[PDB]
PDB file of C-alpha atoms in Angstrom:
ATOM      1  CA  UNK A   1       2.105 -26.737 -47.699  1.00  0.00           C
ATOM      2  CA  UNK A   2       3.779 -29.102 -50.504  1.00  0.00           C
ATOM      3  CA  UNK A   3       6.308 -31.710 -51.055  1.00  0.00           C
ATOM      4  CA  UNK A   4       7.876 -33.406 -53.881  1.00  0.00           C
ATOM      5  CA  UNK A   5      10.629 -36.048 -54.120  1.00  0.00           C
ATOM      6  CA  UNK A   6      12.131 -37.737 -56.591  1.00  0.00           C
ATOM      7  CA  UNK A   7       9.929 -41.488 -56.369  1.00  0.00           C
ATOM      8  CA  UNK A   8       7.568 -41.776 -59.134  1.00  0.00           C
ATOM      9  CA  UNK A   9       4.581 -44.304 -59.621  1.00  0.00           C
ATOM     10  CA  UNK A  10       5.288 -48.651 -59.295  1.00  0.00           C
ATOM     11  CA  UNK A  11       3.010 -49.238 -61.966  1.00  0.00           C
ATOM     12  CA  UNK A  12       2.014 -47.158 -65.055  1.00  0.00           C
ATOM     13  CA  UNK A  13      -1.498 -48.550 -64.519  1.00  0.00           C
ATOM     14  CA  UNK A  14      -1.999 -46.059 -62.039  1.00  0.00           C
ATOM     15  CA  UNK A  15      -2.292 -43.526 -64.391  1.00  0.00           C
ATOM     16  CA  UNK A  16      -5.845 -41.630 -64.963  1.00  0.00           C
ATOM     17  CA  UNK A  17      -4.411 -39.086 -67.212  1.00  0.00           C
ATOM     18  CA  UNK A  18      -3.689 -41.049 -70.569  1.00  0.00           C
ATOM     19  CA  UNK A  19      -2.740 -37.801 -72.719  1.00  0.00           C
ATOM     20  CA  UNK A  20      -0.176 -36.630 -70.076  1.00  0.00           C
ATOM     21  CA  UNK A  21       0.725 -39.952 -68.491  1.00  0.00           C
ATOM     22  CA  UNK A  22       0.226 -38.848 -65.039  1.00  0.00           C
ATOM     23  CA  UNK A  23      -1.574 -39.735 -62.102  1.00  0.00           C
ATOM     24  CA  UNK A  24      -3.461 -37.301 -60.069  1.00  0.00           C
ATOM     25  CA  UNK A  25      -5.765 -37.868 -57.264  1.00  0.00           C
ATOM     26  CA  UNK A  26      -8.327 -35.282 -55.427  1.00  0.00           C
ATOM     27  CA  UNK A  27      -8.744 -34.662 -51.993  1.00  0.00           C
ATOM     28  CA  UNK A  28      -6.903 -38.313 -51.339  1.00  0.00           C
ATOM     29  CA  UNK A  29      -5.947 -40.105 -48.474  1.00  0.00           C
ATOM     30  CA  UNK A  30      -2.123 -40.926 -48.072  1.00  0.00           C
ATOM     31  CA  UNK A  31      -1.270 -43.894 -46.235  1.00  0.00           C
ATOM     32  CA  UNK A  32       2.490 -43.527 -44.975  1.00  0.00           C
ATOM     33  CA  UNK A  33       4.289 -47.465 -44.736  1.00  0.00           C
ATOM     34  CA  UNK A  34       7.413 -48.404 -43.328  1.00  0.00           C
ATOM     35  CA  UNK A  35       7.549 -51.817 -44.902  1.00  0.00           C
ATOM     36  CA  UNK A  36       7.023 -53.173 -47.709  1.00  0.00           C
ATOM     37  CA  UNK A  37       3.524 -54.388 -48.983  1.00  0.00           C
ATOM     38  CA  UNK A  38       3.011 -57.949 -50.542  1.00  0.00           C
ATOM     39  CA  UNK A  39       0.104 -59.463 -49.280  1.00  0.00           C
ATOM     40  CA  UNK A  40      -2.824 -57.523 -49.890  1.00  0.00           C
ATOM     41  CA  UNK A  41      -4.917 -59.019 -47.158  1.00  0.00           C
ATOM     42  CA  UNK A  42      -3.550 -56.794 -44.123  1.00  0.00           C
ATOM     43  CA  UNK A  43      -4.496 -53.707 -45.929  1.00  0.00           C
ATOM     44  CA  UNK A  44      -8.488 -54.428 -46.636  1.00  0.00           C
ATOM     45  CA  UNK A  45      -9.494 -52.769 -43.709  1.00  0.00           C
ATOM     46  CA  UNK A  46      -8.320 -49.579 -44.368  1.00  0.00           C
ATOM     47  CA  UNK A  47      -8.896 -49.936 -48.142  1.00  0.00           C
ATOM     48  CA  UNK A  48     -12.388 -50.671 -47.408  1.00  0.00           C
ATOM     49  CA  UNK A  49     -12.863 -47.647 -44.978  1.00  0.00           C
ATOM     50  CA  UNK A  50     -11.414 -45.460 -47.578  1.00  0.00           C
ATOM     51  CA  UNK A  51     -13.672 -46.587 -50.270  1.00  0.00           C
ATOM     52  CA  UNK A  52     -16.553 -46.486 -48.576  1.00  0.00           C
ATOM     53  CA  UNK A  53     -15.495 -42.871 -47.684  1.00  0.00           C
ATOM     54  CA  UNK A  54     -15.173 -42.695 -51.483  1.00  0.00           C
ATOM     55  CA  UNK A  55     -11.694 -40.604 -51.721  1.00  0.00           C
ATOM     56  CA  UNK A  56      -8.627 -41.315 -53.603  1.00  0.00           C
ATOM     57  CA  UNK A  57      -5.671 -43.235 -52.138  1.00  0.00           C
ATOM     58  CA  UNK A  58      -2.200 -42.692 -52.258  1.00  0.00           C
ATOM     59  CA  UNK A  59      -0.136 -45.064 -51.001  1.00  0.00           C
ATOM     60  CA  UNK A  60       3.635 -44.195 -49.770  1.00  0.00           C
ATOM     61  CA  UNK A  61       5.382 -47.317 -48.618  1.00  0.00           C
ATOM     62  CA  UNK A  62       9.096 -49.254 -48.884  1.00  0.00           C
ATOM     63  CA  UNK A  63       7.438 -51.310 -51.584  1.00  0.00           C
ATOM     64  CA  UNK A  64       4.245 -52.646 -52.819  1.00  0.00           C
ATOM     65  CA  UNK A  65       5.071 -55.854 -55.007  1.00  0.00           C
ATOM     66  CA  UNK A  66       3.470 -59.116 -55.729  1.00  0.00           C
ATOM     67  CA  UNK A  67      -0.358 -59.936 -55.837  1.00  0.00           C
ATOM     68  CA  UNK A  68      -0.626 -56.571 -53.699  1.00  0.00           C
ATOM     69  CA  UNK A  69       0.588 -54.308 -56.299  1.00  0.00           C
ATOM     70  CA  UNK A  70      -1.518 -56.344 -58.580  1.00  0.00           C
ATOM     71  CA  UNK A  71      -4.659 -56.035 -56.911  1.00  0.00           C
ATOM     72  CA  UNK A  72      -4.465 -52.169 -56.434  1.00  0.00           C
ATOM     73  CA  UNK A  73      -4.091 -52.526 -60.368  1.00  0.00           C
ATOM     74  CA  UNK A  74      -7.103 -54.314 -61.277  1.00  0.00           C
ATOM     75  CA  UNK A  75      -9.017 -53.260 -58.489  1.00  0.00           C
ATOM     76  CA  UNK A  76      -9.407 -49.432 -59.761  1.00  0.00           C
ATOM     77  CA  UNK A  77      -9.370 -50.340 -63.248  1.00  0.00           C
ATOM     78  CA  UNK A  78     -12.737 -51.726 -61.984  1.00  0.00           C
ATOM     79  CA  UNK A  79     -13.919 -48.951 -60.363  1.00  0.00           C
ATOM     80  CA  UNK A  80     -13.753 -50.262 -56.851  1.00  0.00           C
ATOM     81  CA  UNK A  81     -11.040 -47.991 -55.723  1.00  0.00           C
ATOM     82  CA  UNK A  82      -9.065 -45.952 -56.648  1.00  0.00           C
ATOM     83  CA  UNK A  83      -5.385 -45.456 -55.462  1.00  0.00           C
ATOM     84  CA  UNK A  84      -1.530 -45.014 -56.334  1.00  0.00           C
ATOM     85  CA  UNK A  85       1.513 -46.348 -54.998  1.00  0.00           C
ATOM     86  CA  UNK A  86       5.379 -44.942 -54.877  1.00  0.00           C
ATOM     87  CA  UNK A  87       8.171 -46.038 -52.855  1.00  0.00           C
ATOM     88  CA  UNK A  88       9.439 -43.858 -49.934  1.00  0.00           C
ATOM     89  CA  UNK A  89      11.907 -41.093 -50.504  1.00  0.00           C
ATOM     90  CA  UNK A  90      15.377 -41.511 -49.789  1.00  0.00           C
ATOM     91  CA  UNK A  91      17.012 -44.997 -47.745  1.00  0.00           C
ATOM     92  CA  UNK A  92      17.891 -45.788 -44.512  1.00  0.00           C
ATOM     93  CA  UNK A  93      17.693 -43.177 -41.844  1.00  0.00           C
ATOM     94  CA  UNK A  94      17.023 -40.208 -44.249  1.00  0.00           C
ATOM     95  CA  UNK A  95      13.735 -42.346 -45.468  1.00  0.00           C
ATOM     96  CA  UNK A  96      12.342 -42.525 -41.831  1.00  0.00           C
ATOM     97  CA  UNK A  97      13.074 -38.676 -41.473  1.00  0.00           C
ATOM     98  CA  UNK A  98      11.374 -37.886 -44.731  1.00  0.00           C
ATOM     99  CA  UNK A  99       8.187 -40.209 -43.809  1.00  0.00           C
ATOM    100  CA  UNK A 100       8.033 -38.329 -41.108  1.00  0.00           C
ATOM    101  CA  UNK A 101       7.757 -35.441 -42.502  1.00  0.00           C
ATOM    102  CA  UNK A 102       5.451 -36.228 -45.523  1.00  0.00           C
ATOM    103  CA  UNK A 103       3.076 -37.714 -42.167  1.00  0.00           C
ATOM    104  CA  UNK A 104       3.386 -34.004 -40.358  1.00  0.00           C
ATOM    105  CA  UNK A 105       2.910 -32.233 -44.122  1.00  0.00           C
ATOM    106  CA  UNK A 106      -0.608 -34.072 -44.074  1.00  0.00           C
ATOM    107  CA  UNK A 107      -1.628 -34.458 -40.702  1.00  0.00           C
ATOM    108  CA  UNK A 108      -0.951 -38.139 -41.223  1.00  0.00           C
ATOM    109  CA  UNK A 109       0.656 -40.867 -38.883  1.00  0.00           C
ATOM    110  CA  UNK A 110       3.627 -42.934 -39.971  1.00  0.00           C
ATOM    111  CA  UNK A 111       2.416 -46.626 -39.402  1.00  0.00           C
ATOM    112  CA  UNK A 112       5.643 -47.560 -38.341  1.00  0.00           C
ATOM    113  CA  UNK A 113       5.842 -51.895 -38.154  1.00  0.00           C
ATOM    114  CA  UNK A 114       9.750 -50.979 -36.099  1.00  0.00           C
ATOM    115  CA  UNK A 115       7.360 -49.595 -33.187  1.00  0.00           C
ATOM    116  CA  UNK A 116       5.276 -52.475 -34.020  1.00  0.00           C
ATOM    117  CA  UNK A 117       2.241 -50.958 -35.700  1.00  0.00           C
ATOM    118  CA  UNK A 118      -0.564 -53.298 -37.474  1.00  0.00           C
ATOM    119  CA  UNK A 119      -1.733 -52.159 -40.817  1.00  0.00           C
ATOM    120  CA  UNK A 120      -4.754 -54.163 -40.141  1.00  0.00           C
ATOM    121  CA  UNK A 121      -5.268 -51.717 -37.282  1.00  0.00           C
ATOM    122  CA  UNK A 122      -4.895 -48.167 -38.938  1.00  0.00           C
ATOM    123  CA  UNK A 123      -7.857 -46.119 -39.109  1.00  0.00           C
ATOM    124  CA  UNK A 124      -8.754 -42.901 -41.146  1.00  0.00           C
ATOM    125  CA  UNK A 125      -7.546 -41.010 -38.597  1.00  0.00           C
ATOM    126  CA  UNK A 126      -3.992 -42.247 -39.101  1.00  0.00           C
ATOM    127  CA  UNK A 127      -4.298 -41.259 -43.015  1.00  0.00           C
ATOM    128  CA  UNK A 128      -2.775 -38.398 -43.966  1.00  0.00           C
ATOM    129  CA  UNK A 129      -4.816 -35.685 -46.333  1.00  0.00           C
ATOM    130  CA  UNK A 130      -4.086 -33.055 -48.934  1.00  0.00           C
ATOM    131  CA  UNK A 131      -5.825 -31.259 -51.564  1.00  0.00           C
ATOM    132  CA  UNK A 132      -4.176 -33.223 -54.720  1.00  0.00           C
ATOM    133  CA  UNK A 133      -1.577 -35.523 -55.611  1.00  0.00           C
ATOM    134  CA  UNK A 134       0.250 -35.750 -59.025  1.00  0.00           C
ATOM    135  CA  UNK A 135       2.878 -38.274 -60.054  1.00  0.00           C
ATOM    136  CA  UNK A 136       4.657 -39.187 -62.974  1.00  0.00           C
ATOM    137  CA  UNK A 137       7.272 -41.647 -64.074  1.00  0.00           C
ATOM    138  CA  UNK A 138       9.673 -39.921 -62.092  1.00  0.00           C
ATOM    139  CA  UNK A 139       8.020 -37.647 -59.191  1.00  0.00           C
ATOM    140  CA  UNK A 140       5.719 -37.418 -56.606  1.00  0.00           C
ATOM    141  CA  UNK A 141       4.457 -34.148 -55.922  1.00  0.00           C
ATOM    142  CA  UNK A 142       1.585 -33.430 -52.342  1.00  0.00           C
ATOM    143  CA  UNK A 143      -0.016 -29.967 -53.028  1.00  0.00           C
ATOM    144  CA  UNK A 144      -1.591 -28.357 -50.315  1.00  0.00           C
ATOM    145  CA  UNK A 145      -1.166 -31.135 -47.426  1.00  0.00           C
ATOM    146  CA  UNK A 146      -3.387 -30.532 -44.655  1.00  0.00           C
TER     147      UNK A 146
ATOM    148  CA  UNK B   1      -9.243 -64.762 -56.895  1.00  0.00           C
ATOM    149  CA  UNK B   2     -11.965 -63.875 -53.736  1.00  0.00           C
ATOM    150  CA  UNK B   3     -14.671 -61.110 -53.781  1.00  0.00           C
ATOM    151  CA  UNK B   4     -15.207 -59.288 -50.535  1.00  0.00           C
ATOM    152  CA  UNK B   5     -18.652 -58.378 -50.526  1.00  0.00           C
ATOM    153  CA  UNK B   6     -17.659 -54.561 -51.190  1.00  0.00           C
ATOM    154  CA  UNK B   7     -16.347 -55.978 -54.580  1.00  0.00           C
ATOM    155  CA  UNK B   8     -12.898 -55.889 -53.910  1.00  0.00           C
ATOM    156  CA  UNK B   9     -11.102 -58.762 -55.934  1.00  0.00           C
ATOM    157  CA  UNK B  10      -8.299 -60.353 -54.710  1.00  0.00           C
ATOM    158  CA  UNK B  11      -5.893 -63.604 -54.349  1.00  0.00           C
TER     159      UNK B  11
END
């Protein structure tokens, strides 16, 4: 099954379609956040496992600012990896809901930091999966989830 | 800016 909502990419240099302006992954991992991302360190592990694996990432989250978002940037214009980032749909409760339901789309698993969940500690198995991603400036759109 | 040893650059 699909999804789309309304949350499009937080930074243009995701983009790997130049003529259309759009992103689209392949067979990608999703990683489903609920907090926001600043400090790239906590998130090595899994970016490193999913590298390795060599498959895209897409990364769903409350945020992703700072050096973070900055080293996703620079990290697959080298080649290294190779990922996206959006914002959650919706706010407050109706975000949590809508996680949620992105997670059971994909076979994924909400790391959730209000349970208290470390990002450090999330595995592949814990990433979502679908057959390809697209995104825009001003949607987000999961074909085929798992 | 570090390197891991996978390549990764970061702060």
């Amino acid at each position: 099954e699909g999804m789309q909502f309304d949350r499009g990419y937080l930074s243009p240099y995701f983009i790997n379609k130049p003529e259309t302006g759009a992103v689209e992954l392949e067979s990608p991992f999703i990683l489903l956040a609920d907090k926001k991302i600043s400090n790239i360190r906590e998130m090595l592990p899994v970016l490193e496992a999913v590298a390795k694996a060599g498959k895209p990432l897409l990364i769903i989250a409350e945020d992703v600012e700072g050096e973070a978002l900055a080293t996703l940037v620079v990290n697959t214009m080298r080649g290294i990896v190779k990922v996206a980032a959006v914002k959650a749909p919706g706010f407050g409760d109706r975000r949590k809901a809508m996680l949620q339901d992105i997670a059971t789309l994909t076979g994924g698993t909400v790391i959730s930091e209000e349970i208290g969940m470390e990002l450090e500690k999330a595995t592949l198995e814990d990433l979502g999966q679908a057959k390809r991603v697209v995104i825009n400036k001003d949607t987000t759109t999961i074909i085929d989830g798992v | 800016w570090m390197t891991t040893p996978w390549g990764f650059l970061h702060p």
